[PDB]
């Protein structure tokens, strides 16, 4: 997404990054950028390098990982919606081309990594060879069609539809480890929503209302700042990172005024630069209608769950049955009121 937005927010607005615990969400409908979680769950599930290869020869690690994550979401009261990526644009496809040549360079390193015979190098480069296919995406869509967790497909990008879902007020927050949902427009983001280490790892809750009230910015100047911090569609100018882009936004307040009133020799503009197209992609993306599909949550039927995850991948029975049972017991309970609904915030001492 952005190389260093979260460091800039932690250096500028420490009150904007909330550290709310994973136990804090009951009525919060949560938008999950799904394919980021599928990549993350295809990294770490490994038996020395080989992931969960069953008798047929196709990986199932993201299925079981996203399964046990989803039981941890309903068992903690978090109400997730999983939104998958769509057709990426051409400005993104330049970044996918550089990721593809990075993966090819990882394969060229993998040649003498497997010629040397080191197990750690071949599992590290096999972690770098992780790429989702259409059938893995369809397996995850079918899996969320089993437990009734709702599924949405954006035409362009899931981060944009997650941010517009927060913008429409249908869900509470988007939850993803990239910072593009603040660029796409979400007032609240939940970075590092992981299913373990609740004491060790708090959720970095990014409030964009606090970001705009601390920077003195509107949304569009934050879009030009996120352009200047090196997004996937537009590069930096020349050596401009956090502080110089903060200095240019705080003086000029427009990317057009930045590209005119900078020096042609000091920080020169790169050739074939398309900041207007990335700005229009951030403000107005191709987003599906949030009112067209509802956000339902129904009780699943156990027989189809057993027939899928013990029939076509041949895994365990007692752990899956106990996870479905505690999912059902966590879902059938009544809702719990949050105390900040009844009492308004008068501020924070912050020691």
């Amino acid at each position: 997404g952005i190389q260093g937005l979260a460091k800039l927010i932690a250096d500028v607005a420490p009150s904007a990054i909330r550290e709310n615990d994973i136990k804090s969400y009951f009525g919060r409908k949560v938008a999950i950028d799904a394919s980021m979680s599928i990549y993350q769950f295809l990294i770490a599930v490994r038996q020395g390098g080989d992931v969960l290869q069953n008798e047929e020869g196709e990986t199932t690690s993201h299925l079981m990982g996203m399964f046990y994550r989803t039981i941890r979401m309903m068992e903690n009261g978090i109400k997730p919606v999983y939104v998958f990526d769509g057709k990426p644009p051409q400005l993104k496809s330049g970044e996918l081309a550089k990721r593809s040549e990075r993966r090819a360079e990882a394969e060229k390193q993998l040649q003498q990594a497997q010629a040397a015979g080191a197990e750690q190098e071949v599992e590290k480069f096999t972690k770098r060879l992780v790429k989702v296919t259409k059938q893995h995406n369809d397996e995850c869509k079918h899996l969320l069609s089993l437990m009734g967790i709702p599924y949405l497909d954006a035409p362009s990008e899931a981060e944009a539809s997650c941010a517009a879902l927060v913008k429409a007020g249908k869900v509470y927050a988007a939850a993803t480890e990239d910072m593009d949902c603040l660029t796409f427009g979400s007032p609240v983001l939940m970075r590092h929503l992981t299913a373990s280490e609740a004491k060790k790892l708090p959720i970095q809750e990014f409030h964009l209302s606090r970001i705009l009230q601390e920077l003195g910015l509107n949304q569009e100047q934050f879009v030009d700042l996120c352009i200047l911090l090196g997004s996937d569609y537009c590069e930096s100018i020349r050596g401009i990172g956090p502080k110089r882009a903060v200095d240019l936004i705080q003086k000029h307040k427009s990317i057009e005024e930045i590209v005119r009133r900078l020096d042609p020799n000091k920080y020169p503009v790169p050739e074939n630069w398309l900041h207007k197209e990335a700005h229009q992609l951030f403000l107005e993306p191709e987003v599906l209608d949030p009112e067209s599909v509802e956000l339902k949550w129904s009780e699943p039927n156990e027989e189809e769950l057993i027939k899928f995850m013990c029939g076509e991948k041949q895994f365990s029975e007692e752990r899956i049955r106990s996870g479905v049972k505690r999912l059902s017991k966590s879902r059938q309970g009544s809702t719990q009121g949050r105390l900040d609904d009844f009492f308004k915030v008068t501020g924070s001492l912050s020691s």
């Binding site: 009544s334 900040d340 009492f343």
Partner: protein, 253 residues
């Protein structure tokens, strides 16, 4: 900051109460007294704490200074003291460490303890002084007994109040619990007097894990001031007899 305590078992019972619900909070220590007002980790319950200057043996506080205290660490340090122990909470200018001594009353064991602490960011909710409709007083051990018995059946209590009766209903896979409490007319004591200020009948549902966390404060007093009204969170007020109160807030289900 220097706050000598006439007996330190009170604040030891405060830390035994707070160790099970709060891990991280700040102490709003001013010249008017020691305050704490922080939320849950699960963001369901708020703990308002108040200890005025009138209960300490001495109290000096130049600035309204707040430190971010690990409540498990301060609970382990307050476990070091006795029950007739005299505690001075000491924090000097730019106190990175909160200092405590536990002066034993025979002047034989003076135990200095400095506690390293971190910077925090805890949201403080602005609460009003609402005229509560149904204010229920009861014994504290009775209320802890009621919550601990009803937590065996199910996770939810249904606290219903009649014009003269308090109905702690609960249900689950074990069955249906129903603990009814009348109003005293012949007892007329201080500890054991179930008295209800009566405005309008209420019927609210609360979780029982948070009420079990609330009833770890039961050796502080013999008074649970259950103040509640319709769609308004429940006040559980352990009134310490000389030093403020310990108000537990609980948003209903």
């Amino acid at each position: 900051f220097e706050a000598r305590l006439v007996q330190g078992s009170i604040l030891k019972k405060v830390l035994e109460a707070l160790k099970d619900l709060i891990n991280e909070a700040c102490w709003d220590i001013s010249s008017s007294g020691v305050n704490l007002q922080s939320m849950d980790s699960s963001h369901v319950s708020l703990v308002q704490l108040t200890l005025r200057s009138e209960g300490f043996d001495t109290y000096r506080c130049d600035r309204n200074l707040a430190m971010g205290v690990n409540l498990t660490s301060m609970s382990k340090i307050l476990k070091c003291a006795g029950n007739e122990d005299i505690i001075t909470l000491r924090a000097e200018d730019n106190a990175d460490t909160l200092a405590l001594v536990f002066e034993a009353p025979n002047q034989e064991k003076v135990s200095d303890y400095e506690m390293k602490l971190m910077d925090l960011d805890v949201e403080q909710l602005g609460i009003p002084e609402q005229e509560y409709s149904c204010v229920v007083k009861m014994p504290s051990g009775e209320f802890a007994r009621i919550c601990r018995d009803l937590s065996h059946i199910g996770d939810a209590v249904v606290i219903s109040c009649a014009k003269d009766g308090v109905k702690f209903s609960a249900s689950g896979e074990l069955g249906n619990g129903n603990i009814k409490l009348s109003q005293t007319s012949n007892v007329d004591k201080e500890e054991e007097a179930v008295t209800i200020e009566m405005n309008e009948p209420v019927q609210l549902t609360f979780a029982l894990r948070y009420l079990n966390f609330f009833t770890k404060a039961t050796p502080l007093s013999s008074t649970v001031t259950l103040s509640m009204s319709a769609d308004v969170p429940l006040v559980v007020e352990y009134k310490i007899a000389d030093m403020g109160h310990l108000k537990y807030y609980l948003a209903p289900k």
